[PDB]
Amino acid sequence: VMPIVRVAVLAAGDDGGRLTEMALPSELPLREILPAVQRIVQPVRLSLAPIGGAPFSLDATLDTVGVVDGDLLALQAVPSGPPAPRIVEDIADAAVIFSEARRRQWGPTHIARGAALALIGLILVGTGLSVAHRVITGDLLGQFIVSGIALATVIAALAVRNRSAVLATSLAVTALVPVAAAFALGVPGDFGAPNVLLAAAGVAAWSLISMAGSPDDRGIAVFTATAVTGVGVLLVAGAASLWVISSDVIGCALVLLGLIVTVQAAQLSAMWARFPLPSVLADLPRRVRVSQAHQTGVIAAGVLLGVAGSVALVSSANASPWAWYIVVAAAAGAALRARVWDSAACKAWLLGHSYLLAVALLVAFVIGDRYQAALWALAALAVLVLVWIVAALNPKIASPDTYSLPMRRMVGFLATGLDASLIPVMALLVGLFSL
């Protein structure tokens, strides 16, 4: 017989397009079979190209080029020639000519971006100024200005909800810094626990009222992120303000809740689809994106608490070593749970859990007047960036293929055992089950 390969070619150059299968004889120069493909699917010459790549040399054959049975090949043009390079002998005309390809025109469209960035900077720096005016000195003028600018920005967000649909979303997502600032300064005292409660309540309320109210699919993810954590710490906050003092258990419950949101997430992720986010399934591309968005959002919250809780455990010194076990346990858990999510931002957040943990422990230590361990945090961050580097150089550690099936089973088993292994030491540390 004769070796043949069944492929499917795609050519869309004039109107719509044509995708169809065919059988081509392997071990032939493409310059021989291209006319047949053209005749079937129909001064520039054409050639086959793997979708997402560069066209094939007109001499190579489908066999040597590396096409397996059942590929999908597009019918592109023979790559190119030179662009016929221009030439000018005067230097001034050279300067004026060779600069056009920039979109350098000022136009009434860079002014819009400039004004929006200036407004966001105004909001942020005004919140910062007024807070630093209160938190240090202490008077009603600070919180007054903060609440004023917060009401101003939320009204502006609701006012342009259908004006540009992007200025509105950006203004909203930046409006939750002054909202938190305002709702973090009630009943001053020592700023206490319950101010965190009120601030988280306001933040979660704004994230909710804006997520469904959002005009499109966008960085809505961070919304749902600042929504989930918005409620998460909220709950724990209430405890430390209502039930009892609860000195240390705050971070314990926080990291527990973080792990909970992290693992059992896909269900709650798909739950938001029931809520109204806004021709049989024409609105599929939106939904899935939004759906995907919510995942890439919610998992972010699922890790923020994981730090925001752990930071409480190993903050001070002389803490029980069980805290230094629960922190690294949650870290390893959120690290090894990246193998399953298989998406870009999800895997990214799950891996960067330990990185953000290192940086947060470092800043908490330098705030906490500790330096014999801040250097240790920096060294741990160094080991982490080193393993990142060695993974990037040689695709060995993060390549889930060149491993052992027994080792893969053991890794999954160890992860499944260790992520939940913290609630026993949780109770042993908090002493809640020592009655």
Partner: protein, 328 residues
């Protein structure tokens, strides 16, 4: 005897070639505050920039014309099928003009300054700019060009086998792809023809004499004995109209073996180079096909800055995709 027919269609309208004669006003006379002469410099330089842009437009138009008339020797594969295959005629300005490669064309337009401000004491800038413009812009950059074969009567090439034959294949394909066989007929005489080499010529409908059979293919001008080639060529030539090409592949064995005509322009490759070849004629040139260029002998005057090489299999594909058609 069994192949499709063709109709001598009307050649498409090529992109225009405005052969105007643009003139430039001469620079000032340099006599008065320096501010005045500075403003005059500025005005004159602006005018010069405008006319430079216009000249660049002229040049781009000429290059677009040459491109539309001499595409790269790999696009012509898509030619034979369309309504643009044998589109050239014995009256056009680019007829029997084999494309050999890209180099600097002399910019057909004029660019003549109306030199009347004699006694040159001109403003130094307003004159240096004009000299730069006249010396640089007057030559189009790398653009298609080649051999006006209709007035050459011999092409001697020089170099190794798989490069001389490469360029020969390239422009012989570029020729047989834009002409009816009734106008030109390609021939050949080679000792190793049926070798994956010029055997591709087998298909070209430009290599068959009138009224021969040879059983399978009508004539097959291809052969080995140059004398036997002339014998098969005997009735085709007493004319000193149908053009011809007769190419050789043996370095030795006496090229010019026909005359010394009026349309028979033989080609041959050699390995010996001339020593002090006296007056390389406007016709009968000598071409060393170098690594990546084609240098014409002149008293080393590259005259071709990037050659063209068509692979054997590519020439075969051209021959096949061309052998369908014929006109009688």
């Amino acid at each position: 005897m069994s192949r499709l027919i063709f109709e001598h269609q009307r050649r498409l309208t090529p992109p225009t070639t405005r052969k105007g004669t643009i003139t430039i006003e001469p620079p000032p006379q340099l006599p008065m505050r320096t501010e005045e002469v500075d403003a005059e410099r500025a005005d004159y330089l602006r005018y010069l920039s405008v006319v430079r842009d216009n000249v660049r437009a002229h040049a781009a138009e000429q290059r677009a014309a040459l491109e539309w008339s001499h595409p790269e020797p790999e696009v012509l594969a898509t030619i034979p099928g369309t309504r643009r295959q044998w589109e050239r005629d014995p009256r056009d300005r680019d007829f029997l003009v084999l494309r050999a490669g890209r180099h600097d064309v002399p910019l057909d337009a004029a660019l003549k300054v109306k030199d009347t401000a004699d006694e040159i004491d001109l403003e130094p800038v307003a004159h240096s700019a004009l000299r730069g413009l006249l010396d640089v812009q007057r030559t189009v950059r790398d653009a298609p060009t080649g051999l006006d074969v209709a007035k050459l009567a011999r092409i001697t090439v020089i170099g190794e086998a798989d490069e001389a034959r490469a360029a020969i294949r390239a422009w012989i394909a570029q020729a047989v792809t834009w002409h009816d066989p009734t106008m030109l007929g390609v021939a050949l005489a080679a000792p190793d023809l049926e070798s994956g080499d010029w055997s591709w010529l087998k298909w070209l409908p430009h290599v068959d004499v009138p009224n021969e059979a040879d059983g399978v293919g009508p004539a097959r001008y291809l052969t080995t004995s140059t004398a036997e080639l002339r014998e098969r060529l005997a009735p085709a030539l007493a004319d000193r109209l149908k053009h011809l090409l007769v190419v050789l592949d043996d370095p030795d064995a006496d090229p010019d073996d026909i005359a010394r005509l009026t349309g028979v322009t033989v080609i041959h490759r050699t390995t010996e180079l001339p020593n002090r070849e006296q007056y390389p004629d406007p016709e009968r040139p000598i071409l060393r096909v170098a690594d990546g260029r084609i240098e014409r002998w002149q008293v080393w005057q590259p005259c071709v800055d990037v050659a063209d090489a068509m692979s054997a299999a590519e020439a075969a594909h051209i021959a096949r995709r061309l052998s369908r058609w014929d006109s009688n």
